C-alpha cells in the first residue's frame, strides 16, 4: 500500500522533509538518525500534523538501520558538514549506509544529499549496489530554484514560470547556462533585448545563485527549507510517476564526453527511477565549464 | 472577504468552472443564465461538494442580471454557437451583458469565452467600458494545452514540463510557433536533433492541435472540460495574484504591428489584471501568419 | 505504478469523476461505455487538463470490456435510469459487467452507483465473485453531504465541520439519524437548546435532504457533480489508504439484526477495502426505520 | 491584493509557519525578530520554495517593528520560554508589540502563541486595543491534535475523523472532555461499549495528551511542527473565510460562568475574526475542571 520513506539523517533538512511528506500525504515516514531518541521526538511532533493536514501518514523515529527494510525511497542527509578532511569520514558513512541498503532495501529509490553530493552519490551507488537509474543526488533543483526565483522577482512573474538549467555539479563549480533560461517558455534574451532585464543584473543574479548558501550563513541562518522542498519534489516525481524534467546528479555514461562519474544534468524522474538522461547540446564554452565541474568532483572522489 | 465570481452562461463549461472553483475554494459562485431555474439546479448540486472538498464557497443560480453587482470576476460563456450569421446575434448578447457590467460591476475582471472569442472580447470591452487590463479572452491557454499535452505523451515527460506558444487568435487561424516550444526549459529542436521526436510527428501534432475541437465533436463529444480548466487557471492567476505568464486574447496597442484589435499573446495575469503584455520577437514568417489571424478577426468584427 | 481506474459508464457522473481524478492526480483513467466513440471524445477533452492541473494521469476512452484488465478500481454508473421495470434490465447489465470483473480484474476494488444502489451492489457482488470487503455502493456520502451542507448554512460554519449519519439505504427510505448529527464535534442538540437552530428548521432540512434529487430535477437540472465528488472521496480513501469513516452500502452480516443483504452504514475505507464495518447502536425507533429501508431493498431484489 | 502576514518571532515555530504559508500560497510573509539578520536568512531560504510549490508569496525578514504596517494577520511567538519569573518579562514584550499593533496595524487579526498563552493573549489584547473578535490564542487546536491523533491510531481510522474538545486553558490544567470525543461523527462511548478501545487505554491517552510537550523534550526534541500547523489552520480559516469550528483562547464574557478573562473554547473563525463563541453545555464536574484552569490563568495574570 503506502510508500515507505526512510530519511537517513533527522536534522533540519530531515525535519522539513517529514513535514512536507505529511502535508502532501506522500507515505509513511521513518526519521532515522544515530542520535538517541531525537528522531522519535521530531516524529512524534510531526505525526500530529496529520490532523491539520487531513492526511494519514505514519511518522516514526528510528535508531536502527534495519528499519530501512521495505523502504521504497531512501533520502540520505547524514554526514559531517579543511572540508577535504571530511571526505573519507563521509565516505565511511556512505559505506555503512550502502551495506544496509543492499541488505535491507535493494529495490529502493535513493536520493543523496550529503556534500559534496556528486561525490557522495557515486560512493553510495558503488557501496549499495543499486541500479544506476535508482540513485540520484540533489543539486540542480535546489540551485535553479534560486536562479529562477531571483529572475522572477526582477521580471515580476510567477516563480515557476522562469525555467533555467544549472549543470555539471552542485557547489561552487556549478555551471549556469544563460542560454537555457526561459520566462513563460520565452527565451530570456528577448527580455534582455526589450530592456526588461539587463546582462549586468543577470551577472549579479548568477553570482548570488552560486553564493546563496554562503549568503544565508552570513545572515546567521542555514539553508534547509529549499533543499528539503527540492528533495521532496524529486521524491514526489518518483512516487507519483510524474515524469518531471528535473536536474539531478546522475551517472554519466558518455554524455558531455564524460563517463564513470556522477554529474548534474536534466533527467526524467518517474516510476522507473531515472527514466531518461537528457544531454544538453552545449557549445564548447559551456562544455569547458562542465569539464571543470567534473574535474573537481574527481579530485574529491580521489580523496575519499 | 471572499471573491464573488459570476459565470454569465451556465452550460457545460459553466458547470465545470463552478465545480473547479469549489474544489479550489476560489470564491462564492453565481451561475447565471437566461434559462429559468437550471442554474439553480446546477448550483444546488455543486454546493454539496463543499463537504467533500473541505471548502466554503457559496454556489447559487441566478436568472437576474443585477446579481453581477459586486462581481470581482465575470466569465462569459453565454451565446449562440453559416457561423457568420451568429455574429450580430452574439454581439447583441455582449451589448446587453456589457451594459450590466458597466452599471453593476465596473471594477470586475472579465474573461470572455464566447466565440469568435477575439471578436467577442473586443465587443464586450467596448460595450462594458472596462479598462483594457481588466478584460481578456480565452484562447492560448486552451490551444497550447493540447499542443503541450500531445508532445509530452510522445516524449514521455510530465505534461506541464512542455511549454509552447500559440498566438494571433483562437480558432482555425491560430498561429503555432514551433520555435517557441520547450521541454523542461530545453528547446524542442534538441529533441528533434536527437531523434526523440521527428518534424513529421510534430507536423501531425500541430494539425491535431488546430483541429482538436473538431476531433472531439467527430467522436460524439464536445470540448468543455479543458476550456473550463483553462478559464479557471486564468481566473485563479488574477485572484491569487500569481502573475503567471498565460497566453490570452488582449488589446493590441502596436505589438506585432497591430493596433485597435484583440489578439492572442502571452500576458502576465496578477491582481492588476493584465499587468504585462509580452510581445514575442517573431520573424517575418511567423508575423505573416499572425497577420492572417488578425485579418480574420477584423473580417468577423466588421459583420457584428 | 499508478493506479488504473476504470469507469464503467461514461455519462455525466463519469465525466466529472474523470475530471476530479486528473485534478487530484489519482491514477490513469479509462472512460468505458457501450456508446461508440463518446468516451474517447470525453477522455481526449479531459486529458488536456493534465497541463493545467500539473498532473500526469492518462485518460482514455474504451468501447471494450477487456480494458478492465489490470483495474485497481472499478466504478459502475452504467444502467437504465415504472422504475421497477428497469430492475431486471439493470440486473442484466450487472451480470455482464460482473463476468468481466471476475475474468479481467478479480482483485479490483468496486464502487457501484447504479440505482437502486443497495440492490445493484449486491447483484454485482454475486456475479463478480469479489470478496465482500472489495465492493461497496454509493449512498451515505452523497446523502449526508446535503444534510451536512444545509445545516452548515443555517449555522454559518464550514460545511465539513457538520457531521451526520444517514443509514439503511440510498433513496426515499434513507434513515436520517437526528441523534448522530454534530457541529465541530459538538452534539447538534446543544445548538437546538441554544436556539441557534430549531427542530422545525431541522425537520424541513431532513425532508429537503431526502428529496434533493427531485428538487434538482424540478429545477431543470440533474444531480451529477455531488455524486461524482462523493464517489471520488470513497475511491481516494481506498487508493491513498486514508481509512476515512464513510457511510456506504456494504454487506450486512448481522449488524442491525440483518444479514445476506447490502445496506448503508459507516465503514472504514483503506488499502484493504472495507477494513471495518461500524454498527451504530441505534434505538428501537431508529432500528424500525432501518428495517423499512432493508425491506424495500429486499422487495426490489426479488424483482431483479 | 495578497494578505500580508507578519510573524513576530522568527524561531522554530516561525520558520515552519513561513514554510507552510508558501506551500499553501496564503500571502506575503514577514519574518520579524529582534535578532539581527537571522529572519533575513530564513526568509531567503524559504523564498526559493515558491518555485517548488508553484506559489507566489514574498518572504522577507525584518528587524523593524514598523514592518507591521499593513499587516492583515499577526502571529506572535516572541518571548522568553521559575517559569513564573518570565511572566513580567514576557508582559513587557507584549506591551511593546501591542503598542506597535495599535499604531501600525490596528485592523489586523492577531494570533498569540507565547506562553502562558491564555495570559499573554489577554495582555496583548489590552495593550494593542484591538476588538475582542480580532485576537485569539493558540491552544485547543494543538492540544486536540494529539488527542485526536492518538485515538485514531488505536482505532485505525483517519486522524481528522476523530474529533475532540479540550477547553479552559492551554498547558497542564487543560480540560479534556471525554464526553465530547467522536469518531466519524459517532460518540466514542460506542467504541468503548464494543471493546474497540477501553477506558484504561483512553486514560493513558489523556495523560499522554496533557504531557506531550514534556514527552517530546524528554526525547531530545522540541514541539514546533504541530504548533506551527495548528497556527496556520487558524490563520487560514480567517483569511479564506472558512468558518471552521476551532478551539482557541478567546475573551470569555459570561460563558462557563466566567468573564474578563481569556480561556479555550470552540470558536468559529471567518473573515470577521471570531464570528461565534461556542459555549459547551458542560456538567458540574467538567465545569469544576474549567474553573481550575481559569484560576491558574488568573494566578499568572496577577504576576505579570
Helix content of chain A: 40-55%
- The coarse overall form of chain A would be globular
CATH superfamily of the largest domain in chain A: Lactate dehydrogenase/glycoside hydrolase, family 4, C-terminal
**Strands ordered across the widest β-sheet of chain A:** 3-2-1-4-5-6
**Can you identify the CATH class of the largest domain in chain A?**
Alpha Beta
What is the total domain count of chain A? Answer: 2
What is the CATH T-level topology of the largest domain in chain A?
L-2-Hydroxyisocaproate Dehydrogenase, Chain A, domain 2
Catalytic activity (chains A, B, C, D): (S)-lactate + NAD(+) = pyruvate + NADH + H(+)
GO biological process, one term (chains A, B, C, D): lactate metabolic process
Subunit structure (chains A, B, C, D): Homotetramer.
EC number (chains A, B, C, D): 1.1.1.27
What key attributes describe this structure?
homotetramer, 304 residues, alpha/beta, Rossmann fold, L-2-Hydroxyisocaproate Dehydrogenase, Chain A, domain 2, 2 domains, 6-stranded parallel sheet, 3-stranded antiparallel sheet, 11 helices, globular, L-lactate/malate_DH (chains A, B, C, D), L-lactate dehydrogenase activity (chains A, B, C, D), Lactate/malate_DH_N (chains A, B, C, D), oxidoreductase (chains A, B, C, D), NAD (chains A, B, C, D)
Amino acid at each position: 500500500p503506502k510508500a515507505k520513506i526512510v530519511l537517513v539523517g533527522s536534522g533540519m533538512i530531515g525535519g522539513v522533509m517529514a513535514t512536507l511528506i505529511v502535508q502532501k500525504n506522500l507515505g509513511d515516514v521513518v526519521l532515522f538518525d544515530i542520535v538517541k531518541n531525537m528522531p522519535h521526538g521530531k516524529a512524534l511532533d510531526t505525526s500530529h500534523t496529520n490532523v491539520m493536514a487531513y492526511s494519514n501518514c505514519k511518522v516514526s523515529g528510528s535508531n536502527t538501520y534495519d528499519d530501512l527494510a521495505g523502504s521504497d525511497v531512501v533520502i540520505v542527509t547524514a554526514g559531517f558538514t579543511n572540508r577535504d578532511d571530511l571526505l573519507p569520514l563521509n565516505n565511511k558513512i556512505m559505506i555503512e549506509i550502502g551495506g544496509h541498503i543492499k541488505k535491507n532495501c535493494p529495490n529502493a529509490f535513493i536520493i543523496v544529499v550529503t556534500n559534496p553530493v556528486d561525490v557522495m552519490v557515486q560512493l553510495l551507488h558503488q557501496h549499495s549496489g543499486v541500479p544506476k537509474n535508482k540513485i540520484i543526488g540533489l543539486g540542480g533543483v535546489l540551485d535553479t530554484s534560486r536562479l529562477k526565483y531571483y529572475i522572477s522577482q526582477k521580471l515580476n512573474v510567477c516563480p515557476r514560470d522562469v525555467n533555467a538549467h544549472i549543470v555539471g555539479a552542485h557547489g561552487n563549480k556549478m555551471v549556469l547556462l544563460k542560454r537555457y533560461i526561459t520566462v513563460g517558455g520565452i527565451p530570456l534574451q528577448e527580455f534582455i533585448n526589450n530592456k526588461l532585464i539587463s546582462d549586468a543584473e543577470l551577472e549579479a543574479i548568477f553570482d548570488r545563485t552560486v553564493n546563496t548558501a554562503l549568503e544565508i550563513v552570513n545572515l546567521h541562518a542555514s539553508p534547509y527549507v529549499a533543499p528539503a522542498a527540492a528533495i521532496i519534489e524529486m521524491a514526489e516525481s518518483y512516487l507519483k510517476d510524474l515524469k518531471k524534467v528535473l536536474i539531478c546528479s546522475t551517472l554519466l555514461e558518455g554524455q558531455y564526453g564524460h563517463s564513470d562519474i556522477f554529474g548534474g544534468t536534466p533527467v526524467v524522474l518517474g516510476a522507473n527511477g531515472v527514466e531518461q538522461v537528457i544531454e544538453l547540446q552545449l557549445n564548447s564554452e559551456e562544455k569547458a565549464k562542465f569539464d571543470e565541474a567534473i574535474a573537481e568532483t574527481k579530485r574529491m572522489k580521489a580523496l575519499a
